[PDB]
RNA sequence: CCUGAGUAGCUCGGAAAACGUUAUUUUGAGUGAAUCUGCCCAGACCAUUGGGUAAGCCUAAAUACUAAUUAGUGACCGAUA
RNA sequence: AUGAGCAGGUUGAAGGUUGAGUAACAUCAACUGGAGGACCGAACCGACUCUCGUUGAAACGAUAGCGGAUGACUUGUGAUU
RNA sequence: UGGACCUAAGCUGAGGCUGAAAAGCGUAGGCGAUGGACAACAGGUUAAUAUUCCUGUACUUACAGUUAGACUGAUGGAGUG
RNA sequence: GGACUGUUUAACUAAAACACAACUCUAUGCCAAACCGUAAGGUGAUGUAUAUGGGGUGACACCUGCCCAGUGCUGGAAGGU
RNA sequence: AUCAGGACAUUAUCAUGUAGAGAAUAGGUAGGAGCAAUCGAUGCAAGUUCGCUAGGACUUGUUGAUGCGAAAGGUGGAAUACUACCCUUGGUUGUGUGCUGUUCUAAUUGGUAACUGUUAUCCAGUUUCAAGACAGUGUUAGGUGGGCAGUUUGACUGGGG
RNA sequence: GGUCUUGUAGCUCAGUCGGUAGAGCAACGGUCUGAAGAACCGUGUGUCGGCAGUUCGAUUCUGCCCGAGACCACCA
């Protein structure tokens, strides 16, 4: 199962530093906060090392979550569209936002399916939350052309 | 094959008795469930794993 | 609009009522387009491997299937025009070729209410309520007949597409979807209102009065003479054999595959159309 | 300090042992322990008693035979064989 | 799927064409016409039947009829259960 | 007329999808011709022979020169078969 | 008696049967039940309920009477199960 | 994951009770010659509950420190009140045993549709959409079931069974 | 029959189902039809489902049986 709980969300109150409840194949087996890791790094001698690692990642993780929040408030994205006879022509798929995310040299996730097709256009906000203490918010601007 | 592929837990190939009790054989098939295993660089596609194998791998912490 | 058949023969007659069949599927001498013509798979009623799927099939008189586009989402918001009514012997409905005015020909179903030359508009938007205007069920007003029903958003119409098929609308549901649709065969379904559908009724309403008349017409359209299960053989149905008239075997006569067939429903447990019903044939689902 | 983890055993069906499933060997599914400071086994089970260290691996031989080479043998026949 | 034959004698509904005609249709009248699981039947194939045959020339034919042939007629090679 | 061309029902089949094995579906390509497309006729010729061998006459197919004008424009698509 | 043009015991009965037309009953939303395949995959059908699968009767026309007591079927439902 | 609901035995709670006679509604058993009085009586005006229509019971102001006859006159087969038991009868915060109503996407899926590989039907990944813990899945077990099988349906007998 | 229900007048259902058996139907006394049909108003009768238990006046109350309905003919 999962023994890494650097962060915490289980659709109810649960806390980091390893505090989970049994779910089998679920959010506990799928959230980026909770991923499987071999038990060779967990023991009474390794308890303190694991706690130190969990702490270090907790502080640096909160710091990086804040910093990413501000930098996405600073750095934005680009989009464009074509129009035909006064009405929209198609639908929006997350395939293409994966494309634009990869094009810059990194990757996004798949198991966060919460969105439907966006029949509208123009500037708006896509809010995907990855962590528990600092929210991640993205602004997407689509230029009508 | 109707059996798990990564770690081959073959169906129990024995003889079956019942209210029947006849000289035959049977395969007690394995609990093929489309679960996922931990693999780097994505490629975590759904694959058939037996539930005894599933609990053994859960004890071995490989998703 | 049908007409009876006068035998005018010196050996027996027939009792047949046939449609004109030269206004729908009208080609006197047909010169089909060769760059748009295809050849189909022909097993004569058998599986692709060849094994039986239905009893004694065969007799198709060299049908050729014209390509049809039922999604109609690939040319949205573009004003097309009804260009032609193409032949389609493989179906009971003969679909219509249109051409969107960016230079894009395509096919759509043939509903009653389109004329050759009408500037039609197939788009997923609150547009004019006319046939040939494929448009989601959400903006379709209540009490209007509709066809090209589908139950998967962004999938294309599959239900209610045969010649003369239609449906009815009498309200919605408190789910943001599942608009109440009285669908044919007496099923009060609730399919998603985001689904795309064509308002109106498919052409060839005269198909409700066709009469075969001959065994020639029986075997000219993929059907073969059928035998009652009473006159079977042993090991086929228990009905056959003996003197006098052949009995009906068990208290429920069987199929040529060997299973009882009286009053039994064989609905699947994995189809997305059983839970989405208001009133079923005897129950509600 | 170590001496080999879904493996004992329990539940439903099970495969050799005389055994046609009882100790011993075996598990498709729910399960389940430790490494001697240890556990298992010992024709229910337990304590004693004894036997052994486990939940990794290879190994010739005695086990079938005489088509390739060589030689010989016959209460084998003799063309209806 | 690729193919092919159906003579001759035929029939002549409908469809279409024209005048008289009737308040108007109605009604009468006429020609193309060619549809038909349409007809006999040469080609064609089939095989319902009389006799032979039933230790046949034929592992099913010979005599004589007969069915259909403008379509449920005849039909080859390839290919499919 | 085939093969050097491809296509019918349908199939082999690089990959691929399932399945004790075995094995099945389908894909590139390749098949599947009774189809499409490809161009030649008369006279005379052996104990067996012929647009095929010879005579008088043609189509079809590219290169070496060769002179020559023209800006060629696909594999994609338009029409055709 | 059967609808007739018609088909069968491929070689006795090839018919008054069966078939056809027509009449009626049965379940089902695109893997539509139904079926096949061996899961894959696929047919029905590459059909869309004005379609597919089966059952009973059987030119045309009038009907198809009474009855759930029961089998099968149908749906519902507390409780024993 | 979440979510609440009510059930069965349900703690503690509140009301449930007439053959007549018998101050008398008679729940029964039962300690008792007891206990009601500001622990506000004999009761009432009302509210509330029950109601069989005897009227009963709890509550606020009130009756006033007096008696309660339901300690006890009297009772019947069953006698009180207080007092204790069994209740009655159901709720109820209530724990456990089976469960129901929720949503959620996150297990689970897709000849739903698209992109790319693949201008490649089989596909891989990316996805769309659809939902969604349901079903399905291995095992178990209940039922289904001549569609199907290995087979069986004794013998005697002036022939058969 | 063993996991369950279970019975009333000649019949249908209440029962102080322990103390009692009553309402409608064959039938009754009368009634109007000539008379009789046709007729309206009350009942005559009374297996309390039988055996072992309980007892104040008990097959009814409990337990066992007659039963309809449903898992239970030592073996593929």
UniProtKB/Swiss-Prot annotation, chain A:
Pfam families xrefs: Ribosomal_L9_C (PF03948), Ribosomal_L9_N (PF01281)
Function, as annotated: Binds to the 23S rRNA.
Gene: rplI
GO MF assignments: rRNA binding; structural constituent of ribosome
Keyword Iron-sulfur applies: no
InterPro entries for the chain: Ribosomal_bL9, Ribosomal_bL9/RNase_H1_N, Ribosomal_bL9_bac/chp, Ribosomal_bL9_C, Ribosomal_bL9_C_sf, Ribosomal_bL9_N, Ribosomal_bL9_N_sf
Name listed for the protein in its UniProt record: Large ribosomal subunit protein bL9
PROSITE patterns per UniProt: RIBOSOMAL_L9
Sequence similarity: Belongs to the bacterial ribosomal protein bL9 family.
Keyword Cytoplasm: no
Swiss-Prot record, chain B:
Region of interest (Disordered), ranges: 1-20
UniProtKB keywords: Ribonucleoprotein, Ribosomal protein
Gene Ontology cellular component annotations, sorted alphabetically: ribonucleoprotein complex; ribosome
Pfam families reported in the protein's UniProt record: Ribosomal_L28
Signal peptide as annotated in the record: none
A GO MF term: structural constituent of ribosome
GO terms for biological process, alphabetical: translation
Family, as annotated: Belongs to the bacterial ribosomal protein bL28 family.
UniProt name for this protein: Large ribosomal subunit protein bL28
Organism: Mycoplasma pneumoniae (strain ATCC 29342 / M129 / Subtype 1) (Mycoplasmoides pneumoniae)
Swiss-Prot record, chain C:
Region (Disordered): 221-265
GO molecular function: rRNA binding; structural constituent of ribosome; transferase activity
Pfam families: Ribosomal_L2, Ribosomal_L2_C
SMART domains: Ribosomal_L2, Ribosomal_L2_C
InterPro entries (alphabetical): NA-bd_OB-fold, Rib_uL2_dom2, Ribosomal_uL2, Ribosomal_uL2_bac/org-type, Ribosomal_uL2_C, Ribosomal_uL2_CS, Ribosomal_uL2_dom3, Ribosomal_uL2_RNA-bd_dom
GO biological process, one term: cytoplasmic translation
Assigned keywords, A-Z: Ribonucleoprotein, Ribosomal protein, RNA-binding, rRNA-binding
GO cellular component: large ribosomal subunit
Family: Belongs to the universal ribosomal protein uL2 family.
Assembly information from the UniProt record: Part of the 50S ribosomal subunit. Forms a bridge to the 30S subunit in the 70S ribosome.
The protein's role, per its UniProt record: One of the primary rRNA binding proteins. Required for association of the 30S and 50S subunits to form the 70S ribosome, for tRNA binding and peptide bond formation. It has been suggested to have peptidyltransferase activity; this is somewhat controversial. Makes several contacts with the 16S rRNA in the 70S ribosome.
Name the UniProt record assigns to this protein: Large ribosomal subunit protein uL2
